[PDB]
Design a protein around this ligand. Structure first.
Ligand SMILES: Nc1ncnc2c1ncn2[C@@H]1O[C@H](COP(=O)(O)OP(=O)(O)OP(=O)(O)O)[C@@H](O)[C@H]1O
Ligand SMILES: Nc1ncnc2c1ncn2[C@@H]1O[C@H](COP(=O)(O)OP(=O)(O)OP(=O)(O)O)[C@@H](O)[C@H]1O
Ligand SMILES: Cc1cn([C@H]2C[C@H](O)[C@@H](COP(=O)(O)OP(=O)(O)OP(=O)(O)O)O2)c(=O)[nH]c1=O
Ligand SMILES: [Mg+2]
Ligand SMILES: [Mg+2]
Ligand SMILES: [Mn+2]
Ligand SMILES: [Mn+2]
Ligand SMILES: [Mn+2]
Ligand SMILES: [Mn+2]
Lengths: 683, 289, 289, 683
């Protein structure tokens, strides 16, 4: 057992009835005195290091060639002047095991934290030394964290794509299904998580070229996609991850759900394909009134109306579908379906729940399309247009496939530096740069939507960490007040930066003129409701920072009207799995699952306390499972009212609560305006 | 007053030999003398025979004649343990340690060994003599079963325990300890059923039943002495094993509610060291907040 | 060719009632109509009563007459599951859903019920008719056993599976699914033992045994139709239950190595949702001609 | 039970110790006087029938519009003038259950045998009334039988494709793998059996752009193809059938074979994809000498040499592969691999065996490409060039994917009519028409190869029927002499028709100039060896027909040199599974499996005696399992010497014989020049 691992395991050993949290710090020192410095490759000067990394195909020549060597050296010096120290052993371990650049033999460390941050900053700035230094100060203060793809791969020649969330629309044809399989394989090859909408696909027992009972339904397509994702597994590094979304009014919805049951046969169950269910308000109304619902055959609806079932508003179309004899449908019990969803989420955490009307009643780009499905993490909610992939030697009709750009603000570090505006604007600029530098040659609709929509996702993390280190309970009304104010400022500065980029470049996102930004509707609740903190403690937390008022929001609305907005979507709160360790932050805006988490690496045990955990804030670091899920829903809705896309919202349940409690949480989330529900993790 | 607690104890003791990896005994086995290996194989083969008949015949037949679904469930479980778990575990041990020819030879040896045949003849004869609704024939078979559980196994158990206590053949020894733990509770349970029948009798009848039990014990004992000498003389342990079987004979008598018959002796201290989520429907009030 | 394989599959399927918490079923149970609750109770009592016969007589009697130590062990294990696991599981479900007085009344009713009694006594009659060293009478009893395990239980299993497939009574439905999974393997195993006897017979004797099996199936099937209408008409399910009976009758026949009797039918989707040539090395000069 | 069913079952009820074969005839009468005539749909005249079939989308109107109605009436009258009668109940039953056109609800019969033959002939003639009458006379005499796709689908609006088998080359890339999956689904949707060569795909543990041990090998692609064929299953009517072919020198050859082991795990086992193994002469030489062989990693060979492993001759490059340190290889025992092949074929009948050198030593188009794999029935052996399917928005390099049209000569009817020449030429014309009217819009390489190669497959059926009905034992040397003469005549007249078509159209197949037809090498054995019958009985059988001599072959060689050949490939002997029933013929050139076959249809059982089976020819109808497989190999080699493509050669084995006997049969087949071995069916 290594010395740092012993020093880390000494945390659980209680002295005077208290955990030895400070010992973790010592572990970090050991982890750097015994391992990191010994296995870190050192060079006589930075010029030699850069030459070795470029020549050995570690870095890219293009992004480094935009700067003189003096500017690169100045950026590296700015990164190293902070003298950044990892506060916990797990932060440094996760960085140097997951993100630090290693030799081809994987035994030496080529990149420190400062080196990786400097390289990512130089990639972000695209030739501006001052902008690169600003990015270096942003990331070394740990105010902003690029996502795992961006942070890991920026500036590296041997790399995947910087985007890892991809949403694909699948049209109801064999050509479109095969193209979807191909694109899923190509994007998993790039290292991205792929979500596919299967609602347009006709159900099982439908007609193919006017022969009856011929379609295999969406379950056969799910089997094909599951095989494709198993095959494309990042060159045998990570398990291929894919998601499939189906509307709850699709007839296959039960069989869809049956793919996640343990009792399902081998020809029914898909193991590497996550599933999500899109639930329109009509289904919730039918379940609430206990009226029996109807699941429709999509192809009959398409033949009758010329549009797909998921392309029209089910609230106004459901009665017409039911009363139409030419539309084929099957009787179901919506309450039984809700109970089945709750039971499946209890067993396996699936499916993801998308409340379609909750997403689309605040969607700014409904003119382009309504949000029909979400991503693999159930937080990307954007307009998508299906593509018509025709036969060979025939021109395809390329639509819009969602691929947003991830990046997370560290709420604790951002707010302690009183730099919400600067961090949000710099993160928006970096996300815009990464979106502009993304070029996928095997996903035509993804590339077209990236060029047109210019959608980015700016998330936040360390919400619970910040609240606990400031003596605020996550379920307290003060925490929701802080979340409201902080995320309203984040939205304000994100919109301001998007409008500034649109003014500078002279271009907005495609079909912006039809958006609620152009019409000013988006700013309605912002020009009438003041989002300043209602509690003195939160106001003192925001001291030293200008909180945008209704007049500021009116000025921003006028600015957007005059200049437009560059990004169709700006904010989405991703789970932030492993980057939260490196940043010493709690994951996403979720409450912490455990105060101290026990992990097993190799044959060794390691202990990670939550950041800033001590005896004084032990009570404020309440575990997520012990919390009331209604108050967690309230906080997530408070944040969601300022996020244009969704939030990865995992439910944290105890083994005691039943499926009725899960359904109640889901229905309260639907009532409170929650757009997506990610997971049902049972303790 | 007791069946439910025996039911719970029996089912919580459930195990399979495959839970214990046996390849760890390979070296301590290789290191034993030919005499020691021979005695060990034969000892376990004698045990296998006893469990074969206890599982095939003894426990099922007693289950058939004992009234009450819970009593029958306990006896059925014990029967399963005898032939599906205990008897089979010995083959797991044999298949690990010994080549097929040595295994074949030891099973041929059980068929022709006169002491092992005599003890099987006597015990199984009593099982097959049980008459429906005749509590006396049932008592006699239960005495025979207690003597098998709590006395007869022990000439066999001695040797695995003797090695376990020296830190030798410890994986095989772990299996044997699990078997022994089961037989101890089986002997107590059947003993309690036998006492139930005995307690229904006149004093005159009781006196005859004690005579039966003591005569049977002595007859089995005299045969076991010859069996013990036959197996253990080549490893120098016959006198020690004899003390052990007398010790356990007293435990068998006690399981039957009788006084100890043999005087106490010091047992080898080595052998002593050898010892889905819940589902509720959705109410109309869960859709409103 | 098969006993060790079935041994493995049986022991690895071992489970205990305590593993499934039952109390959460009360949430759904309270929302069923009187006819649904009545049918469920009656079906449950039917299964309980039939399974008790299998534990007390069916499995132990077959274990008694079958030759082979390994077969006796597997059969003992199956008898144990009936008495120690299945019987306790049915009792647990009852005690959770109904008060003591209601349980006693349902069992009184089902005990007097003409269609339940007809099939229970037909099966028990064949078990009682087995004669020592007569393989024909053993075969007839094995046929009866396979018909119980693979066919007669299924008019009953239908209802818990129907609820289980709808998200109702999930805890008891999980228990029933585990029980059913055991009965399936029991039916297949006893079926193989029956085929072994069948294959030892002359062609005339085989034809006679086939006629016996089909005649017995017909008698049981006609009574199942009446049993089905008696229980399921009040909840409108009899048509679909009848399809499920025939489908399972065909499985029972296939277990006995016989052809299906009934045409193939699709089953209710809710219930569905609930549910070597000799290697010889090349010797050279085989490449030259 | 139906009356005809009872009459057919009356065959096995022996009278005076003999089977009641004549009862079969009675059955047909019943089957027509009680079912077919009552279930047929009669119109006032042919005009109303044709109009009803055209407007109700049963028939394509284009092919019928090329004839005036008087010509169509004359063709139908020619078809009905023969007064064709089905001699067995099963012939009529199979036609009216599998090939006769029925209504949309399949309650009535719209097409008789004469109607189907007339429609197929009118489609074949393409506006020529005399040619249509010639086709009608050819098919009503049952001299020629179009394949099941062509016979069933010709002239139908709801038809699929007329091509039976498709062969795809899969290049070593994710884009090519995805395109192969798409094309396989498209062609299975069209109803054709798809064969894919997986020998170019790099093995398991190869590098995908410098990251090593990343590839899943051919087994992952096999699983993808298996799921694709499961999904595309002819709209749920016929199970999707695919074939995978791998070279025996591929490193994955064991894992490949492990896909068919009955003990294979679910993550490896493949159940709807047939497997074939391509064995060069080098492997047989290594196994014969007992020298340990080496299987190779295709990607290392491609990197070192610039060509794929299966793209070059292993007999000359195996030593270079072994001695090359930059080529990665694994040691294997070739005799153990042969024994594994024999064991697998005994257990499941797989893999198909393709003796590559036997195919390519007489292959006429080696200049275009060597034959590297076969079809799903292991009788199509043609040159194929792999396609380079590039990224989206990049032009793809379209290669040649094999596809040929099947058609079988009925040997008994052809020789009874003494019309080998006329039948062969008319069948060649019909297959040329089927190729010309075939246009597949989703398989580009298949379309290009169909347009360029112009390859057709002209098979033969009722070899054993003709031999047994003429008192010739199938294993006798007289039978092999008859096969030699008959198939030399078939080859002669097929080459003559191909050259005549090339002359009349002024065009040959692509790259004909480099073929052995152009250089005259192909005719060598035909201009030096006489293939006239060596037995008087066979010569009498061939009386009334001009058997080509060496002078006729020299004249044909000169004619080909002057005019060229229209078809790259002309003759391939398919299994001819179910269409042999309608023709009252034994399946292909294979010997009969059983004299009387008991088949269960519905709840009834039927007995089909072999065509012409009687007391006097009972022992001439020797069952295949009772035959010496060495003499069957001799027969198949004798036929194969005159067939440019392969023959679907099924091995018929007894349960008593060992895997050593199967290996001996395989090695004797390789020694005798057998190109492919189809199945190892054990009695
Ligand atoms: N907690 C830590 N986080 C990150 N790096 C660390 C940490 N502890 C030590 N290191 C690394 O080890 C070096 C030694 O640091 P130490 O605590 O011994 O003193 P120092 O004054 O920071 O040293 P130096 O002269 O290297 O700057 C640091 O410069 C840094 O590179
Ligand atoms: N074996 C058969 N094959 C094909 N069609 C048949 C067969 N048997 C009967 N039919 C059809 O059923 C009709 C019944 O007539 P059948 O053969 O009994 O003789 P028919 O009335 O004297 O006239 P004909 O033989 O001249 O058609 C036939 O005309 C024919 O259309
Ligand atoms: C992407 C991917 C490829 N492969 C294998 C199958 C293909 O035959 C083979 C080639 O993939 P390619 O698509 O050719 O990958 P590449 O072009 O980026 O890499 P290279 O330059 O080396 O050609 O890699 C996998 O096994 N799994 C995968 O996920
Ligand atoms: Mg379409
Ligand atoms: Mg490549
Ligand atoms: Mn025991
Ligand atoms: Mn015991
Ligand atoms: Mn049971
Ligand atoms: Mn049972």
């Amino acid at each position: 057992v290594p010395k740092w691992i012993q020093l880390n395991n000494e945390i659980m050993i209680q002295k005077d009835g208290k955990f030895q949290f400070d010992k973790d710090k010592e572990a970090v020192h050991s982890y750097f005195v015994d391992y990191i410095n010994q296995n870190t490759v050192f060079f006589h000067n930075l010029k030699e290091k850069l030459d070795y990394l470029v020549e050995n195909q570690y870095y890219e020549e293009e992004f480094l060639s935009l700067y003189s060597f003096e500017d690169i050296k100045e950026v590296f010096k700015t990164a190293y002047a902070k003298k950044f120290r990892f506060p916990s052993f797990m932060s440094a371990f996760k960085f140097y095991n997951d993100y630090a650049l290693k030799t081809n033999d994987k035994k030496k460390i080529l990149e420190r934290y400062e080196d990786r941050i400097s390289i990512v900053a130089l990639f972000f700035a695209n030739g501006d030394t001052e902008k690169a230094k600003e990015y270096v100060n942003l990331m070394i203060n740990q105010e902003y964290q690029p996502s795992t793809p961006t942070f890991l791969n920026a500036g590296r020649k041997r790399r995947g794509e910087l985007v890892s969330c991809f949403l694909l629309e699948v049209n109801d044809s064999l050509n479109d299904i095969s193209r979807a399989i191909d694109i899923s394989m190509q994007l998993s090859k790039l290292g991205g998580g792929v979500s596919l909408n299967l609602s347009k696909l006709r159900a099982k027992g439908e007609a193919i070229k006017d022969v009856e009972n011929a379609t295999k339904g969406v379950v056969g397509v799910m089997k094909l996609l599951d095989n494709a994702f198993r095959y494309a597994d990042q060159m045998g590094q990570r398990q291929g991850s894919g998601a499939a979304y189906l509307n709850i009014f699709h007839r296959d919805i039960n069989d869809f759900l049956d793919t996640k049951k343990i009792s399902a046969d081998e020809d029914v169950r898909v193991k590497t394909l996550s599933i999500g269910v899109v639930i329109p308000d009509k289904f919730v109304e039918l379940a609430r009134e206990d009226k029996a619902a109807y699941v429709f055959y999509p192809h009959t609806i398409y033949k009758e109306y010329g549009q797909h079932m998921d392309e029209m508003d089910m609230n106004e179309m459901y009665d017409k579908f039911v009363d139409n004899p030419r539309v084929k449908k099957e009787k179901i019990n919506p309450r039984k379906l809700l109970e089945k969803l709750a039971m499946l989420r209890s067993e396996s955490g699936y499916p993801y729940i998308m409340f379609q009307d909750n997403v689309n009643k605040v969607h700014a780009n409904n003119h382009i399309s309504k949000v029909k499905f979400s991503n693999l993490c159930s937080e990307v909610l954007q307009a998508s247009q299906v593509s018509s992939y025709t036969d060979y030697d025939e021109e395809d009709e390329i639509g819009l496939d969602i691929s947003c750009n991830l990046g997370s603000l560290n709420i604790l570090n951002v707010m302690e530096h009183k730099s919400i505006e600067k961090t949000v604007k710099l993160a928006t600029d970096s996300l815009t740069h990464v979106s502009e530098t993304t070029d996928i040659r095997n996903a035509p609709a993804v590339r077209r939507a990236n060029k047109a929509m210019k959608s980015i996702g700016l998330g936040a993390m360390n919400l619970h960490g910040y609240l606990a280190q400031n003596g605020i309970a996550y379920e307290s009304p003060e925490a929701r007040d802080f979340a409201n104010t902080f995320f309203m400022m984040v939205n304000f500065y994100s919109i301001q930066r998007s409008a500034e980029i649109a003014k500078e470049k002279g271009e907005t996102f495609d079909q912006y003129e039809g958006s609620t930004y152009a019409t000013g509707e988006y700013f309605d609740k912002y020009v009438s409701t003041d989002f300043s903190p209602k509690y003195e403690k939160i106001a003192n937390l925001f001291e030293g920072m200008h909180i945008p008022t209704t007049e500021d929001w009116k000025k921003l609305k006028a600015f957007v009207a005059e200049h437009g907005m560059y990004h169709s979507y700006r904010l989405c709160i991703a789970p932030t799995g492993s980057i939260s360790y490196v940043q010493s932050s709690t994951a996403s805006v979720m409450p912490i699952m455990e105060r101290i988490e026990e992990r097993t690496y190799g044959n060794s045990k390691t202990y990670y306390p939550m950041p800033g955990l001590a005896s004084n804030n032990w009570f404020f670091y309440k575990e997520a499972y012990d919390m009331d899920m209604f108050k967690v829903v309230d906080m997530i809705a408070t944040i969601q009212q300022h996020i244009d896309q969704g939030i990865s919202f995992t439910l944290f349940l105890k083994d005691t609560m039943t499926t009725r409690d899960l359904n109640r949480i889901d229905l309260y989330a639907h009532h409170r305006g929650i757009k997506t529900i990610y997971y049902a993790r049972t303790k | 007053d007791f069946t439910q607690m025996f039911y719970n104890q029996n089912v919580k003791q459930f195990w399979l030999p495959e839970e214990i990896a046996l390849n760890g005994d390979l070296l301590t086995w290789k290191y034993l003398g030919k005499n020691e290996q021979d005695t060990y194989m034969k000892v376990l083969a004698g045990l296998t025979l006893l469990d074969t008949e206890q599982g095939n015949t003894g426990m099922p037949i007693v289950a058939e004649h004992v009234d009450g679904h819970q009593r029958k469930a306990v006896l059925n479980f014990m029967a399963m343990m005898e032939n599906a778990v205990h008897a089979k575990s010995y083959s797991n041990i044999f298949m690990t340690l010994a080549p097929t020819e040595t295994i074949n030879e030891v099973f041929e040896w059980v068929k022709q060994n006169k002491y092992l045949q005599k003890k099987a003849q006597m015990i199984v004869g009593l099982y097959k003599a049980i008459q429906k609704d005749d509590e006396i024939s049932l008592f006699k078979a239960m005495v025979a079963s207690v003597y098998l559980e709590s006395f007869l196994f022990y000439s066999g158990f001695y040797y695995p325990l003797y090695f376990y206590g020296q830190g030798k053949l410890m994986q095989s020894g772990e299996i044997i300890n699990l078997i022994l733990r089961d037989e101890a509770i089986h002997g107590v349970y059947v003993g309690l059923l036998a006492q139930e029948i005995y307690n229904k009798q006149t004093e005159e009848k009781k006196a005859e039943l004690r005579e039966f039990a003591i005569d049977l014990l002595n007859q089995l004992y005299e045969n076991e002495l010859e069996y013990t000498e036959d197996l253990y003389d080549q490893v120098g342990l016959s006198h020690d094993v004899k003390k052990f079987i007398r010790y356990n004979a007293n435990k068998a008598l006690m399981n039957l509610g009788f006084d100890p018959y043999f005087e106490e002796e010091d047992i080898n201290p080595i052998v002593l060291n050898g010892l889905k989520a819940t589902v509720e429907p959705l109410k109309d009030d869960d859709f409103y907040f």
